[PDB]
Design a protein around this ligand. Structure first.
Ligand SMILES: *[C@@H]1O[C@H](CO)[C@@H](O[C@@H]2O[C@H](CO)[C@@H](O[C@@H]3O[C@H](CO[C@H]4O[C@H](CO[C@H]5O[C@H](CO)[C@@H](O)[C@H](O)[C@@H]5O)[C@@H](O)[C@H](O[C@H]5O[C@H](CO)[C@@H](O)[C@H](O)[C@@H]5O)[C@@H]4O)[C@@H](O)[C@H](O[C@H]4O[C@H](CO)[C@@H](O)[C@H](O)[C@@H]4O[C@H]4O[C@H](CO)[C@@H](O)[C@H](O)[C@@H]4O)[C@@H]3O)[C@H](O)[C@H]2NC(C)=O)[C@H](O)[C@H]1NC(C)=O
Ligand SMILES: *[C@@H]1O[C@H](CO)[C@@H](O[C@@H]2O[C@H](CO)[C@@H](O[C@@H]3O[C@H](CO)[C@@H](O)[C@H](O[C@H]4O[C@H](CO)[C@@H](O)[C@H](O)[C@@H]4O[C@H]4O[C@H](CO)[C@@H](O)[C@H](O)[C@@H]4O)[C@@H]3O)[C@H](O)[C@H]2NC(C)=O)[C@H](O)[C@H]1NC(C)=O
Ligand SMILES: *[C@H]1O[C@H](CO)[C@@H](O)[C@H](O)[C@@H]1O
Ligand SMILES: *[C@H]1O[C@H](CO)[C@@H](O)[C@H](O)[C@@H]1O
Ligand SMILES: *[C@H]1O[C@H](CO)[C@@H](O)[C@H](O)[C@@H]1O
Ligand SMILES: *[C@H]1O[C@H](CO)[C@@H](O)[C@H](O)[C@@H]1O
Ligand SMILES: *[C@H]1O[C@H](CO)[C@@H](O)[C@H](O)[C@@H]1O
Ligand SMILES: *[C@H]1O[C@H](CO)[C@@H](O)[C@H](O)[C@@H]1O
Ligand SMILES: *[C@H]1O[C@H](CO)[C@@H](O)[C@H](O)[C@@H]1O
Ligand SMILES: *[C@H]1O[C@H](CO)[C@@H](O)[C@H](O)[C@@H]1O
Ligand SMILES: *[C@H]1O[C@H](CO)[C@@H](O)[C@H](O)[C@@H]1O
Ligand SMILES: *[C@H]1O[C@H](CO)[C@@H](O)[C@H](O)[C@@H]1O
Length: 470
């Protein structure tokens, strides 16, 4: 009643707020160039008035999906983004130049100039995310007869990012939270996905990605090492416990609606992703006063990692939403399959929600299935109610919400917060993203090798966009 309604409304605010944070007509970000996604309009305490390759990549993939589903008015936004990326790719920065590491640079100034101070660089997820966002649009272009745009503009840009992923996946860098210098799950997971989908896209435009092909199975191989036997290790080279919403994000951003409950790829309904979900969420239950009194069967406010001290370490809107989004994704998957399986690995996850849980297979007409899917949906929705509870009255969503009183804190109107609302809502409604080919890319090689493949680098110039109609 309350929730369903709040969401319809929030989805509208979320779409507007996002556009307000994109140049060069964005109402909140005067100064940002055309196609530049600003993290937040907050210029002071904290200063988030920059454009991050990850943030923009995530937001744009979200907008691309809205567009393909009928939000035709987002066309110019997407086109501006792509054109801005042709320029950014060639900007010389502390990470290097186009062909010498430049692509791994985390953030840039909104005016498209390099950010030259000290930063946790490089961040190798960036290029994989940007490539995923473009491939989605490039697919639309091929399907609607704009073959030339797809082949001469998108492909060349994706080609750069994919060469980067193939070349450096096997090197340390900073995590998505920009603090741990090592090897991180999220990064590895989104890289694997980009290579696979880059390869298919390349073939579709009449070309190839030999380096996509040789490296994908190796990244997948390596990805298996993050499973500890209990949960997904967020990063190697860390002294933390390793329980981090990074791993939830990793699953949801690599969710393929055609995939079964594959452990190799950590799908939302995979026993490993389910076991992981409980361990990560449970880590926040006793550290936030806001969670005081809630039982193990109830949704709680979720932060990044239990050890977080950032602004004292508080719940984040996007983290809380990720916790719900994974569940909506699993429900979808179970429904499509027509069954749900409970294993020894996922028993704790299920039992906390449905105390009569026992291992076995449960068809969709079975009493147990109905019992579990209801409890799961209720649980997922509870995460969303927490968000509704703490959002501003006009719908404004901040980065964080206070661990004790739930007031909004840290960067205001965070673009990533709004994109996270949209995808969770979509998933809640059975609106899923296009497949990335997970079904021909979940086989793990017998032996993992520490390797790379060098692709090719070439600067792209976007002279003009054909007069596309949608
Ligand atoms: C829902 O409603 C909310 C509530 O109104 C809307 O949010 C508000 O949006 C406006 C813009 O439309 C923001 O205005 C901008 O404010 C900053 C200053 O912000 C700091 O100070 C604020 C006030 O400080 C005093 O008053 C408060 C009020 O009670 C006291 O609490 C304080 O103690 C002080 O006494 C303060 O409110 C701000 O806090 C918010 O942000 C922080 C940090 O991110 C959060 O932690 C907080 O929780 C809180 O959310 C903040 O501390 C100005 O700097 C901005 O001016 C720039 O932009 C103008 C145009 O937008 C321009 O005219 C100016 O010249 C200036 O331009 C410069 O900066 C731009 C970048 O932003 C550049 O692009 C530009 O080139 C140039 O360099 C602006 O005035 C409000 O801060 C914001 N308020 C809140 C509470 O968030 C919200 O948008 C609505 N949502 C929807 C979906 O509609
Ligand atoms: C480049 O690619 C190669 C090839 O894929 C990568 O090499 C593999 O590296 C993984 C990760 O180190 C490694 O797996 C380790 O094997 C050890 C021996 O079998 C294990 O002792 C070790 O255990 C850690 O991880 C477990 C989960 O897998 C945890 O349960 C366990 O507690 C350990 O975790 C703690 O210790 C680590 C230290 O390794 C610490 O950083 C953690 O934060 C945590 O505190 C691993 O299982 C494979 O054996 C390697 N494979 C090969 C063929 O050598 C290489 O890492 C890649 N390099 C980069 C930078 O990407
Ligand atoms: C993931 O993909 C592999 C093929 O690479 C399949 O064997 C598996 O069944 C799943 O579809
Ligand atoms: C599944 O396919 C992979 C490649 O994607 C192989 O390396 C593996 O051995 C299995 O045949
Ligand atoms: C890394 O290793 C693989 C095989 O182990 C090679 O094929 C590759 O060229 C790189 O040297
Ligand atoms: C990636 O790194 C490998 C090293 O294993 C090189 O052989 C390859 O040329 C590329 O630089
Ligand atoms: C990897 O190595 C190849 C071979 O030298 C280069 O052409 C490519 O630019 C990348 O550096
Ligand atoms: C790698 O390959 C691309 C395209 O095949 C070239 O344009 C580039 O100069 C490099 O040789
Ligand atoms: C490498 O490839 C790009 C994309 O086609 C060109 O713009 C550049 O001139 C070089 O041939
Ligand atoms: C490719 O890179 C060149 C510089 O090497 C740029 O001038 C061009 O704008 C594109 O970014
Ligand atoms: C795109 O094309 C222009 C030439 O028309 C180059 O100068 C630019 O670097 C990019 O390759
Ligand atoms: C538009 O025009 C420039 C100059 O010829 C090209 O380099 C660019 O790739 C696009 O075709």
């Amino acid at each position: 009643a309350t929730l369903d309604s709040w969401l319809s409304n929030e989805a509208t605010v979320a779409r507007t707020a996002i556009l307000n944070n994109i140049g060069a007509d964005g109402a909140w970000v005067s100064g940002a160039d055309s196609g530049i996604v600003v993290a937040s309009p907050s210029t002071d305490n904290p200063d988030y008035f920059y454009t991050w390759t990850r943030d923009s990549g995530l937001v744009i993939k979200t907008l691309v999906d809205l567009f393909r589903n009928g939000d035709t008015d987002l066309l110019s936004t997407i086109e501006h983004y792509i054109s801005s990326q042709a320029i950014i790719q060639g900007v010389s920065n502390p990470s290097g130049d186009l062909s010498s590491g430049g692509l791994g640079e985390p953030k840039f100034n909104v005016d498209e100039t390099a950010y030259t101070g000290s930063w946790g660089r490089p961040q190798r997820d960036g290029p994989a995310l940007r490539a995923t966002a473009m491939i989605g649009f490039g697919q639309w272009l091929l399907d609607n007869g704009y073959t030339s745009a797809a082949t001469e503009i998108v492909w060349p840009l994706v080609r750069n990012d994919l060469s980067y992923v193939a070349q450096y996946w096997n090197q340390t860098g900073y995590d998505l939270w920009e603090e741990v210098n090592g090897s991180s799950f999220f990064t590895i997971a989104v890289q694997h996905r980009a290579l696979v989908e880059g390869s298919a896209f390349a073939t579709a435009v009449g070309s190839s990605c030999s380096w996509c092909d040789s490296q994908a199975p190796q990244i997948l191989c390596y990805l298996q090492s993050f499973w500890t036997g209990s949960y997904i290790l967020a990063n190697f080279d860390s002294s933390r416990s390793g329980k981090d919403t990074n791993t939830l994000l990793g699953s949801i951003h690599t969710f393929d609606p055609e995939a079964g409950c594959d452990d190799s790829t950590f799908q939302p309904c995979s026993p490993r992703a389910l076991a992981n979900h409980k361990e990560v969420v449970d880590s926040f239950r006793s550290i936030y006063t806001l969670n005081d009194g809630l039982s193990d069967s109830e949704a709680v406010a979720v932060g990044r990692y239990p050890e977080d001290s950032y602004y004292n370490g508080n719940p984040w809107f996007l983290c809380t939403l990720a916790a719900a989004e994974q569940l909506y994704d699993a429900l979808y998957q179970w429904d499509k399959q027509g069954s749900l399986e409970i294993t020894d690995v996922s028993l704790d996850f299920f039992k906390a929600l449905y105390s009569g849980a026992a291992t076995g297979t449960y068809s969709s007409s079975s009493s147990t299935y109905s019992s579990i899917v209801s409890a799961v949906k209720t649980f997922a929705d509870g995460f969303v109610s927490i968000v509704e509870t703490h959002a501003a009255s006009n719908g404004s969503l901040s980065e964080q919400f206070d661990k004790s009183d739930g007031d909004e804190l840290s960067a205001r109107d965070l673009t990533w917060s709004y994109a996270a609302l949209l995808t969770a809502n979509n998933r809640r409604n059975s609106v899923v993203p296009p497949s990335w080919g997970e079904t021909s890319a979940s086989s793990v090689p017998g032996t993992c090798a520490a390797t790379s493949a060098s692709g090719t680098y070439s600067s792209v110039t976007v002279t003009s966009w054909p007069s596309i109609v949608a």
